[PDB]
Design an enzyme around this catalytic site. Structure first.
Site, PDB file in Angstrom:
ATOM      1  N   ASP A 112       1.321   3.953   1.404  1.00  0.00           N
ATOM      2  CA  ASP A 112       1.844   4.627   2.592  1.00  0.00           C
ATOM      3  C   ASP A 112       2.940   3.839   3.296  1.00  0.00           C
ATOM      4  OD1 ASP A 112      -0.604   3.042   3.035  1.00  0.00           O
ATOM      5  OD2 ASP A 112      -0.432   3.644   5.162  1.00  0.00           O
ATOM      6  N   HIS A 113       3.341   2.723   2.693  1.00  0.00           N
ATOM      7  CA  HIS A 113       4.427   1.919   3.243  1.00  0.00           C
ATOM      8  C   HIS A 113       5.565   1.655   2.257  1.00  0.00           C
ATOM      9  CE1 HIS A 113       2.035   0.933   6.906  1.00  0.00           C
ATOM     10  NE2 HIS A 113       1.059   1.234   6.067  1.00  0.00           N
ATOM     11  N   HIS A 171      -5.172  -7.643   6.149  1.00  0.00           N
ATOM     12  CA  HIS A 171      -5.154  -6.285   5.635  1.00  0.00           C
ATOM     13  C   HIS A 171      -4.686  -6.286   4.175  1.00  0.00           C
ATOM     14  CE1 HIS A 171      -4.365  -1.995   5.397  1.00  0.00           C
ATOM     15  NE2 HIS A 171      -3.126  -2.269   5.040  1.00  0.00           N
ATOM     16  N   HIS A 180      -0.884   3.489  12.964  1.00  0.00           N
ATOM     17  CA  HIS A 180      -1.658   4.650  12.526  1.00  0.00           C
ATOM     18  C   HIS A 180      -2.522   5.164  13.677  1.00  0.00           C
ATOM     19  CE1 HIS A 180      -0.204   4.016   8.514  1.00  0.00           C
ATOM     20  NE2 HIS A 180      -1.015   3.020   8.200  1.00  0.00           N
ATOM     21  N   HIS A 232       0.873  -1.167   0.000  1.00  0.00           N
ATOM     22  CA  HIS A 232       0.000   0.000   0.000  1.00  0.00           C
ATOM     23  C   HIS A 232       0.911   1.217   0.000  1.00  0.00           C
ATOM     24  CE1 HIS A 232      -3.828  -2.137   1.712  1.00  0.00           C
ATOM     25  NE2 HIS A 232      -3.393  -2.661   0.579  1.00  0.00           N
ATOM     26  N   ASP A 237       0.100  -2.665   9.835  1.00  0.00           N
ATOM     27  CA  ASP A 237      -1.309  -2.475   9.500  1.00  0.00           C
ATOM     28  C   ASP A 237      -2.243  -3.639   9.852  1.00  0.00           C
ATOM     29  OD1 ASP A 237      -0.456   0.021   8.770  1.00  0.00           O
ATOM     30  OD2 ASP A 237      -1.533   0.011   6.837  1.00  0.00           O
TER      31      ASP A 237
HETATM   32 ZN   LIG Z   1      -2.132  -0.823   4.314  1.00  0.00          ZN
HETATM   33 ZN   LIG Z   2      -1.096   1.908   6.251  1.00  0.00          ZN
END
Ligand SMILES: [Zn+2]
Ligand SMILES: [Zn+2]
Ligand SMILES: [Zn+2]
Ligand SMILES: [Zn+2]
EC number: 3.1.1.27
Lengths: 273, 273
Positions: free
Chosen positions: A99-100, A184, A251, A97, A206
């Site tokens: 954001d990683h 996830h 998060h 994803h 996550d």
């Molecule tokens: Zn994720």
């Molecule tokens: Zn994330």
């Protein structure tokens, strides 16, 4: 060369509360941090995850309202430590994803590791995973598969963006274990770091966005298999209890404000032993 | 005894747009209809789904802001047709989320049919399915398993609330086919009704809440397996195209306002043939 962990503060994004706490909410904007995990180890410097790319988010997901200062890019955060991307030997991604993996582009020289299933998922995601797997700059192969070669930083080639695929619970290095926590995403990993002189830290990444998430077994709305997602949460709770590990979440703004970041780190030396 | 379909308008509920269009939204309240499908057939009267129970929703899910007039309960809707619950021979449930089985209690005399997996799921749901499988009044067995015997209408026994379990694509009656569409729930069924003198109707039920849902392959946030959920949407699109069926959706206010309800029905006789 005792193990040290430095958290690279990567700024923040926003989601609806219904994204963060699947079906439960409450609704409305929730701003949360994004960070990466730098391990200074006898075997080298390992960077787990690389945050998000600001431009990518402003282009493709501007509704996530990114805030990221100069020192919160990966080069900027490394700079606080007197380091640069070339100082990192190995990059591991928990999942792809955006954001990683948004900073992977800065590490062509590094060895890359991820779950065996994740590059294939980035190449051919489920229809509902396109916004998660939206930044393909971490992989020339995936960018080509997705028609996103325009995203590639100059100099990125298949040769310098190939991953070694892993599966199951495996050691990254002595006392650094990657804990398989699918749900996830198809190949999602959590991270257990052991130290020579203190209790371990279990980074849920996550598999659990927040403390509340893990307590309530209420995962994020972003997932491929929520049954797996809950099973992975149970696995994490049990592992933490077994190892007496300290849990840290991916998060979770309230907890994050209490975490060591920048020049602060985990794994301090004794002073009178 | 030509096949007729009557839609029993069961009032409405509200969800966030993030519930209706998983991850996509937009967010904010969306009010949508709930209805049940009454089939008047040569082989008997078949009722597919039984809407929600108003009291249950006000007690357990008041955030769904139910609106349901007297004529929108199952007995009230049947009353518009000069019928009562005892006139129905067979009750079929697409799944046991509360908005599709809240009127089952009125049909102890009827034969009950559902997917083989659904009563067991109601007895032992995933942690994230408790609000969906929140009304156990349709099953003495499930109510007992869930500690919800207090929900049972007087007179409900195991003997009069046992289901015949089915699996796969099977015929309910001549020209009435239950189409397996898992994902939203483990044993979710859609419904294809064929008529002697017109094209079929494919009721997606909760495999697709709205027309937009099916077009975009964007399912509801309420699901057990979203991969299955998308596969089931593709199955429905293909089946409709093959049969030249008219698609009708479960929770779509704009389309619902154009549907025949009450004394209006589908499957009219010719007048000059
Ligand atoms: Zn994720
Ligand atoms: Zn994330
Ligand atoms: Zn449902
Ligand atoms: Zn429903």
């Amino acid at each position: 060369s005792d193990t040290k962990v430095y958290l690279l503060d990567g700024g923040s994004l926003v989601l609806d509360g219904y994204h963060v706490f699947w079906n439960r909410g409450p609704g409305g904007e929730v701003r949360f941090p994004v960070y990466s995990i730098l391990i200074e180890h006898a075997e080298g410097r390992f960077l787990i995850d690389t945050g998000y790319d600001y431009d990518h988010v402003m282009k493709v997901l501007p509704f996530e309202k990114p805030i990221q200062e100069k020192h919160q890019t990966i080069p900027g955060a490394l700079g606080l430590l007197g380091l640069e991307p070339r100082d990192i030997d190995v990059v591991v991604n928990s999942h792809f994803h955006f954001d990683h993996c948004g900073g992977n582009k800065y590490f062509p020289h590094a060895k890359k590791i991820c779950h065996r299933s994740e590059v294939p998922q980035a190449c051919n995601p489920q229809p509902f995973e396109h916004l998660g797997y939206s930044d393909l700059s971490f992989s020339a192969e995936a960018a080509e598969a997705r028609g996103a070669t325009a995203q590639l930083l100059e100099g990125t080639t298949r040769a310098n963006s190939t991953f070694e695929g892993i599966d199951g619970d495996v050691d990254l290095a002595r006392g650094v274990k990657l804990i398989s926590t699918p749900g996830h995403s198809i190949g999602h990993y959590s991270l257990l770091v052991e130290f020579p002189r203190r209790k371990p830290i279990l980074f849920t990444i996550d598999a659990a966005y927040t403390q509340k998430s893990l307590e309530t077994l209420c995962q994020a709305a972003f997932h491929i298999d929520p049954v797996a997602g809950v099973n992975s949460m149970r696995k994490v709770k049990k592992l933490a209890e077994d190892h007496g590990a300290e849990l840290m979440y991916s998060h979770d703004m309230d907890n994050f404000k209490t975490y060591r970041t920048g020049t602060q780190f985990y794994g301090h030396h004794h002073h009178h032993h």
